Design a protein around this ligand. Sequence first.
Ligand SMILES: *Cc1c(COP(=O)(O)O)cnc(C)c1O
Ligand SMILES: *Cc1c(COP(=O)(O)O)cnc(C)c1O
Lengths: 953, 954
Amino acid sequence: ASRLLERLLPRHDDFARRHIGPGDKDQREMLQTLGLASIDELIEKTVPANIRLKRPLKMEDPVCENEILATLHAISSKNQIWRSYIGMGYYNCSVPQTILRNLLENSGWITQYTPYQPEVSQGRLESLLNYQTMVCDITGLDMANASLLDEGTAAAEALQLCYRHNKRRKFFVDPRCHPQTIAVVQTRAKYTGVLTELKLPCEMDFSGKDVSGVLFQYPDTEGKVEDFTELVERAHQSGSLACCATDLLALCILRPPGEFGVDIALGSSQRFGVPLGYGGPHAAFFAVRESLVRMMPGRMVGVTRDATGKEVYRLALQTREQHIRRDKATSNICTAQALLANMAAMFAIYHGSHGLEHIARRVHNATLILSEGLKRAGHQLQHDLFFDTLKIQCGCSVKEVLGRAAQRQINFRLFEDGTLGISLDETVNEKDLDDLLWIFGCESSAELVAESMRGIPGSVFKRTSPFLTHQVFNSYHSETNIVRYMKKLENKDISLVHSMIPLGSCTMKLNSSSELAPITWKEFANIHPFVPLDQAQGYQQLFRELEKDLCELTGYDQVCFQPNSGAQGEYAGLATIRAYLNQKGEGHRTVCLIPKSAHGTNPASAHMAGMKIQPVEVDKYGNIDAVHLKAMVDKHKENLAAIMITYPSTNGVFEENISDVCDLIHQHGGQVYLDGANMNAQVGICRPGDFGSDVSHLNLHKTFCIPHGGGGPGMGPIGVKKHLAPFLPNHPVISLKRNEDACPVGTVSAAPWGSSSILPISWAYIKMMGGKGLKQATETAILNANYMAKRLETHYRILFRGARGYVGHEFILDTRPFKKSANIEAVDVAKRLQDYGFHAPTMSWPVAGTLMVEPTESEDKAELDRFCDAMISIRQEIADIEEGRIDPRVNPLKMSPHSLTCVTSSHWDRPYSREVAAFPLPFVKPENKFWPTIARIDDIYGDQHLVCTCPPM
Amino acid sequence: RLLERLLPRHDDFARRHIGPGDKDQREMLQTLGLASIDELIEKTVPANIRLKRPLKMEDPVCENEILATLHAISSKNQIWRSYIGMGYYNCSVPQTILRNLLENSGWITQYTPYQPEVSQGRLESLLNYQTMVCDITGLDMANASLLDEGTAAAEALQLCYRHNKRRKFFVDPRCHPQTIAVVQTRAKYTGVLTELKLPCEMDFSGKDVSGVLFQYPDTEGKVEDFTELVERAHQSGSLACCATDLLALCILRPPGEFGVDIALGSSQRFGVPLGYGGPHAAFFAVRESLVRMMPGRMVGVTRDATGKEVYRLALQTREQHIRRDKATSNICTAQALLANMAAMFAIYHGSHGLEHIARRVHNATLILSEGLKRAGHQLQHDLFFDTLKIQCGCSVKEVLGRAAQRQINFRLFEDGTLGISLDETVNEKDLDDLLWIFGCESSAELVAESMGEECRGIPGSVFKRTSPFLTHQVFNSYHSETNIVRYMKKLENKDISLVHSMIPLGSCTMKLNSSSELAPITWKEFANIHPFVPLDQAQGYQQLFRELEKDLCELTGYDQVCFQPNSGAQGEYAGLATIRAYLNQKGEGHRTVCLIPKSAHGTNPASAHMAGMKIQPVEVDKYGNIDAVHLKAMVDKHKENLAAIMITYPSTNGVFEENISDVCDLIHQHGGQVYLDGANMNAQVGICRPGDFGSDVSHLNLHKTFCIPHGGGGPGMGPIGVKKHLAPFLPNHPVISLKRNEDACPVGTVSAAPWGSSSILPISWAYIKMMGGKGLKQATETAILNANYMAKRLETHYRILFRGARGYVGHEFILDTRPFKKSANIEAVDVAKRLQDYGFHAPTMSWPVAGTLMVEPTESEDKAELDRFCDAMISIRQEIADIEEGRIDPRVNPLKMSPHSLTCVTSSHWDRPYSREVAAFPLPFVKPENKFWPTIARIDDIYGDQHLVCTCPP
Ligand SMILES: *Cc1c(COP(=O)(O)O)cnc(C)c1O
Ligand SMILES: *Cc1c(COP(=O)(O)O)cnc(C)c1O
């Protein structure tokens, strides 16, 4: 049926042939191993027939890789790049190009994920410790985490920390916090059951001993620098905590919150060398007094020892987190903003305290110059003491001032009272000042104004305390040195430039160069999130196009991009369900059914949304126990708000009758939340919206190629059926309302579409793959997983399988029997795989003591075979212990991993060879050998001796 | 101004570029017993040749504004769809290669693979390039690149002359015009007569023809059978040389199959940008019997000390550094990085993907051809690959008016006909635009429907390729993007580079290649313009050239700069030829003698021989300087026939000669010109200028002094600065005119494109504009401080062989390791290989003095890095003392067994009289967290040349 022209002149290229690892030969052979005739036969035996697509996906024709950038350029060039002095928590900065090139555009930094396996992850661990040390020094507090999602959510996390600490149900918020910060904190308080009150400090009475805490901002949203010493003292006298939203650059010359008694300091690290990104991604900082550290949200690097006593790094106090404590965790947060936290650390490293003081003083002096010129021109300043931000009452018409600003393509903040906000930044020079003085009608140039001339350095607020004195911040100031340091850290970390990372539940697929390119384009990276929308029409088209495609892949009617992680998606989705229920008079319904196999984020998100959790048992075959499910639905039927399911299941298995589960919940007045992290087994074959699901988050950093970033950034957009659409998140600066009926749940992220600048990656994957390619990717993810399971099944027990004996995109290897037969633990197998050149699969979840393996469609048959052969050879090592051929205390498994220092030493006292230690199979060669940089990590020691800043060098 | 007090400069790029800060500099000065930098300079650079006033440059540009400043220039270029052809064809550069190789400092900061055991990655990749070229051309051995197509064609002519010594050479006039011009220029100064003849007008029967050059497909697009022409040449003892196209050869029977002796061309369309001329790797392949006359580098397979199969540069005595004026060419820096880009293209696509692209391009051309004929236009040739020659059936004016409307360029032939060359980028939409431009009233869909699926063009002809290519596993393994990224990383990790440690290569200037400088070279406004566009499309490039020329004029004291020469050696050749054209026009053409000190770089005598000069060596005295006695005697001897001298300042041993103006005056008084080799300008910039002390012309190495990346062996740029008396004789180009006057009397054309590799010039523009006059001076000052500091630290452990009058060196110095041969049976090579174990690429070896090391740190490395290198050398001196004094076996010790591979240090078997720790971590700064492994044991230099294998073994 093809046109004659298509036969003579086919498509230049098919991106799917690059993205998908196995070719025709690989696929036939894998099918042969499975005893199957075709891919359709595998799918027919795996995915239940009654939930499969009735017609293929309706998508646009695929775009050739050689045209994707020009196609996307026709969109991005519709944005306008103005000079934005809007402020409001986003300030332009000068991103060092050497960090941009050697870290952000380096696949050796961005393809790895959360540092789960410390011995092959010491590089990013050290860098995040640098971030923590930077934040503690600048804020003046004791401990800081390894990033939050953004400023407003960090402020919300402070509120929740205060509630956890003292259980009081009142919380004060200064109305001079940024508007988006207020909205996120109010939304978080609403569903947690805390009452917020908007009050200026002089209206705050703590004397009832009923206030959990207070949030204020320094400098505040109007630019003012205030002394909060007395306010903090009052709070404390009545048992309340004090929380300060602040600015790392301002704090380079301002006495910091730690020095006026603050308990929690938080803000964005964006202006420390990360692009505006039309909202993100940016690492928020969050730091506390030492006495609050047990309640810290998120990850936090700590110092510990390895098996030799060497000082080394590891994620610390991990029982705080969702994966151990579930609904009792300190937060739902999982993917955070790791890569961007590391960008901001490297900024601070490259500049040192001296270079950061230089920038800060320059910015403040530009602001002081601007202020003097505006006063001389007859305009009034509302505050005399500021860092970078002025609040101006125009001495003439505001209209005529703004007409002049438009002529020079400059944006100010327009306050509702008719006054103007101007926030200067690192990028501001003489020419920009002269433009600004002209906008305000001032005859005199910046040079002239300077001549007749203070601020922070002449005030009682000037900083007198040191910061960034550790050698890491005083060593890498030449470009040659910084490049060498970034490389040293990269090379410590195994990543997708080395080998498959078959992390179950993570989807470690290809992050392609063509998809990645656009994120550093100026038309995407350099737009302030709150510009007038006629400057961001390119972003508007991007959002429309990506929404429509995501709607078609999922069977949903509307997508909301605000949630900036999967867990944020779960929280937003659950809150939207509750707002739906509330509006329709069913607000008494708060019970959420959660199978015990759910990801830990699920119960943590449900708790954060104010729901009551009812666990549902899983049966011996791995499926939701239907007896217990029916009993829990009957028990809670009057108060049932929702169920959280995952399809296919978190063990990789397709449930046989998932529509029946959806129908049972619907019949009892609940909504169905479907966790979309496993959509790599669905795309182009079935759709959660077709079988009864009402809302799902998607993980664009798993299924849709956003890079894993060493732990972030992510995007967790939610798709909803149209009955939920009126209740989707809104934003107080940029309105997201589409319909007449709108009744928004609130605001869940600081920026209206979250981390907007990374969405082109997923748009690009989708547009290049098309309908056929997207289907083929899922088909191959399933083929690759089943092929590995088949190869391993006579050596390890494949724990759970579907009705006809097939898995989905991942499977569990049950290593538990080896505990009794050989004193071997799953951790021994994980560490030993490092010696075979592999980052371990997912460990001990959903089943403790086992491994969950997800290869993805991006890895080829030869790579799958290397991994299977490694496992087979490890099975034989275990058999050597089982059968008494090697010492059960000192053998390769128990001594793994084998560091370079171990295998190169003069000593050697092992009952096995160096060759067996370090090159256990012939594919592990000196030419490709990746070294674990340390011996086995000590998980206990670090938590007993807590050290979460850079130790002395 | 008080504005600057309140509002200082955002940043100073010099503080990033220059490694040592204030504390480092004070301490280094203290070690030298000096009070300031001015005191060091005052004691080093002779007072009478120093700048009379400071450099007049623009105010320095902050690093945070350099890209926006450059964008205001680059955006003046217009990016049209160019179907001009003429040896440059747009292609779809794989973004993954672009990101993970071209924009990867682990690929681009290293230089020529002199130290094989820490360079096996790029060596393997270049072997891949060679294998790709041999398979596609059908010839036996290929080199590891040439500079461009026209210079490769010139090298073929010179190879033919070397082979049979005949003074006649035939050139088909259907070769590309720029190729013809480079070949004619080369021949003119070599003394060979070229004759422009069609095959039917070529008579070889006199047995006086060196060889013949023809092109397949030719510049008009035609595919011709040259079987009979090659046979005729051979019957009379002549060679046959074929300029060709690697993409065409994926479906055309290749030159190896029709008896051709040398095949050559550009690899540009195998995934490298147009670059407004470059950089691009040329290919050059020959019959096995001609390999001893091969120009350039060539990778070979050999063994290491354990018998393992490994890679090294082969047959090295052919090259300038060993054979000097007797070498097979002057070429030194080539196009390594770009050769490796084209190999990775071929790897990523395989033969199946290359056939797909080739067939697609040919079918698009077949479709275009059918539409144009149906519209009443005439085609001159019915058998072609991608290129049509069209006689318009209507007015050419109206055709071109429509083409301008769609921003499309054609080639305009002198005869009023039009050339159209399609390429990988061409799709249905572009065909429909083209058909509309030609008035067709049809579409590409419609045209395809009336053709059917009949076999036409190349596949329906006796020319269809039937021989296989790229059957080795390397071309059939890395087709997923995941696999290609992993392969590029594997190779990258084998190679020590500036992402690891200082590479203190004397005469190489291994300074910082900054991210801000590098960014612009992949901007579309620079990368994606065809070199021969109408000039109103390249006004941005014109301003770039003007600005960089003016700054280079001011740094050197010259009056005009020419950017055509695309390496330092090309600069030397162009500069020498310009001198001769000057002398010829003034009635002094009898003067051909060129005085060359014996300490000159090997390129100097090779370039002089290439320019047709007679070479007279000049001796060096016991202090390292030009021997004054012998110089005066050689000037006296040759005074009637003296054309030039080639000097280097400071000298190639790092020493400032005390009276360099006197040398310039002596040559001038006897009717000669002064050529000054500019490779050591990093000891001059902002302190002194070769033009102020009597030099008439210099090449500059932008890839040494001015931050173009070393690229594993290329690319380079070697622009020449000249005094105004030489300016009328500068190179021209036959497609794009470089004449500034009616007075012009050009030497000829030395490179294929008018300004050479234009797209990499922004790097040097950027360095200069960010540094300013003060920063540039500080860089030079610090290059000299760092070199003197290291010499001072090492002088009680090693003899510093040569120094200036007051005891100071310039930017580099020589360590005399020769006495260790008698005292310990230690060779300079032992010290080089042992340094690898300490985490360092060796310095420059055995040049200018055999058996010694020459060390150049540059200003970009800080005191701590210099100290690690000095401490490594001190610890090595102690290892030698252990041998001298009988404390360790003199045959089996760390020096003799170096380098120590991972396989060596990790093995079950040891049995050396020293530890693994001493082997692999000899000092505490060498740690497991930063340990770079030599990938192989010491390489056997003899074995590989005795068992020549220059393609991938099975
Ligand atoms: C990763 C994951 C999530 C949560 O995503 P984050 O972006 O990490 O917050 C939820 N459920 C499952 C099953 C996952 O694998
Ligand atoms: C590098 C160098 C050259 C030649 O420059 P290329 O760009 O390699 O051709 C000439 N002379 C000296 C002294 C050099 O260091």
